[PDB]
From a paper:
The hypoxia‐inducible factor (HIF) prolyl‐hydroxylases (human PHD1‐3) catalyze prolyl hydroxylation in oxygen‐dependent degradation (ODD) domains of HIFα isoforms, modifications that signal for HIFα proteasomal degradation in an oxygen‐dependent manner. The PHDs and FIH are both Fe(II) and 2‐oxoglutarate (2OG)‐dependent oxygenases that couple hydroxylation with the conversion of 2OG to succinate and CO2. Crystal structures of PHD2.HIFα‐ODD complexes and kinetic studies have revealed the importance of a conformationally mobile loop (the β2–β3 loop) that links β2 and β3 of the catalytic domain of PHD2 and which is involved in HIFα‐ODD binding and selectivity; in the PHD2.substrate complexes, the β2–β3 loop folds to isolate the HIFα‐ODD substrate proline at the active site. Here, we report high‐resolution crystal structures of the truncated catalytic domain of PHD2 (residues 181–407) in complex with HIF2α‐CODD (residues 523–542), a manganese ion, and 2OG or its close isostere N‐oxalylglycine (NOG).
28 We added 3C with the aim of promoting crystallization of the PHD2181‐407.Mn.NOG.HIF2α‐CODD complex. The NOG and 2OG structures are very similar to each other (backbone RMSD: 0.078 Å) and, to a somewhat lesser extent in terms of details, with other PHD2.HIFα‐ODD structures. The previously reported PHD2 active site chemistry is also conserved in the PHD2181‐407.Mn.NOG/2OG.HIF2α‐CODD structures, 37 with a single manganese ion (substituting for iron) being coordinated by the side chains of His313, Asp315, and His374, as well as a well‐defined water molecule/hydroxide ion. 38 2OG and NOG bind the manganese ion in a bidentate manner via their C1 carboxylate and C2 carboxylate oxygens. The 2OG and NOG C5 carboxylates are positioned to interact with the guanidino group of Arg383. Although the overall PHD2181‐407.HIF2α‐CODD structures with NOG and 2OG are very similar (RMSD: 0.078 Å), there are some differences in the conformations of the β2–β3 loop involving PHD2 residues Gln243‐Asp246. In the 2OG.HIF2α‐CODD complex, the side chain amide NΗ2 group of PHD2 Gln243β2–β3 is positioned to form a hydrogen bond (2.74 Å) with the main chain carbonyl O atom of PHD2 Asp246. This hydrogen bond is, however, not observed in the NOG.HIF2α‐CODD complex, where Gln243β2–β3 is oriented away from the loop and adopts a more solvent‐exposed position. Although further work is required, given the 2OG and isostreric NOG structures have the same space group and similar crystal packing, the differences in the β2–β3 loop between them suggests that small differences at the active site region may influence the conformation of relatively distant structural elements within PHD2181‐407. 46 It is also of interest because it supports the previous proposal that inhibition by 2OG mimetics involves effects on structural dynamics in addition to simple blockade of 2OG binding in the active site.
Numbering used by the authors:
A (entry chain B): 523 to 542
B (entry chain A): 185 to 407
């Protein structure tokens, strides 16, 4: 089955999440 | 006057819609004046060369453009020239905070920056995909559309979602001042059908705290 991460839209993993 | 009071819109519309269908559309979210201001901010980002090719979570050998044809930039909301985008983000966040503890079993604590995205006509689109297929923390996708005068029968650009367990797919036209929420996981595979005019949208993804922590642990340990 296809590795769906190769189609998934990138987001930063490293230091760039915003806390609500 | 828009935006509407967040508490009622969240509890009486967004929450039941999301739990029943996994997809929720709020039309005329901010009103024409604010939507137009956002459109001008987005067009200024485009005109000043801020957009770069959209990227994928993982890649082996394929060009990103065989997968997604948009160009994007990430906006925090406080940049000069992005004040109204910041207001949009704050308004989305207000809705999510009024949904605390009511969107499935998620505990939403955080989100991405805003992805301002342009499909520059020319038949560009995004092949069928899942936003978060492998547990990277994203639980809700929130998209705001800003395309004044979009005629989808001519210009295309429909977001087609294939919600799991439904007898019909959901076609979302990228209408001006439309806000969309949907579950980011495998329940909602979706495509951006080819666009034949310049198509703009702004996406934020909201994180489930526990899943996002596990994803960050995997990243920080090299796994
Ligand atoms: O712009 C839209 O309607 C849909 N966007 C996506 O599916 C994406 O960027 O991951
Ligand atoms: Cl806010
Ligand atoms: Mg913060
Ligand atoms: Mg590659
Ligand atoms: Mg919440
Ligand atoms: Mn997507």
């Amino acid at each position: 089955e296809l590795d769906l991460e190769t189609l998934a839209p990138y987001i930063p993993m490293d230091g760039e999440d915003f806390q609500l | 006057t828009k935006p509407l009071p967040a508490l009622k819109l969240a509890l009486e519309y967004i929450v039941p819609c999301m739990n029943k269908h996994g997809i929720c559309v709020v039309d005329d979210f901010l009103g024409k004046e604010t939507g137009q201001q956002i459109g001008d901010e987005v067009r200024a980002l485009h005109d000043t060369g801020k957009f770069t090719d959209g990227q994928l979570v993982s890649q082996k050998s394929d060009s990103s453009k065989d997968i997604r044809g948009d160009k994007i930039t990430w906006i925090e909301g406080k940049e000069p020239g992005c004040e109204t985008i910041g207001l949009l983000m704050s308004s989305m966040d207000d809705l999510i905070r009024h949904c605390n503890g009511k969107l499935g079993s998620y505990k939403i604590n955080g989100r991405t920056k805003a992805m301002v995205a342009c499909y520059p006509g020319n038949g560009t689109g995004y092949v069928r995909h899942v936003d978060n297929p492998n547990g990277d923390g994203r639980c809700v996708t929130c998209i705001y559309y800003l395309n004044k005068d979009w005629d989808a029968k001519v210009s295309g650009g429909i977001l087609r979602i294939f919600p799991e367990g439904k007898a019909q797919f959901a076609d979302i036209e990228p209408k001006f001042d439309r806000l969309l929420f949907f579950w980011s996981d495998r329940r909602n595979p979706h495509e951006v059908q080819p666009a034949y005019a310049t198509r703009y949208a702004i996406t934020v993804w909201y994180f489930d705290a526990d899943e996002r922590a596990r994803a960050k642990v995997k990243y920080l340990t090299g796994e």
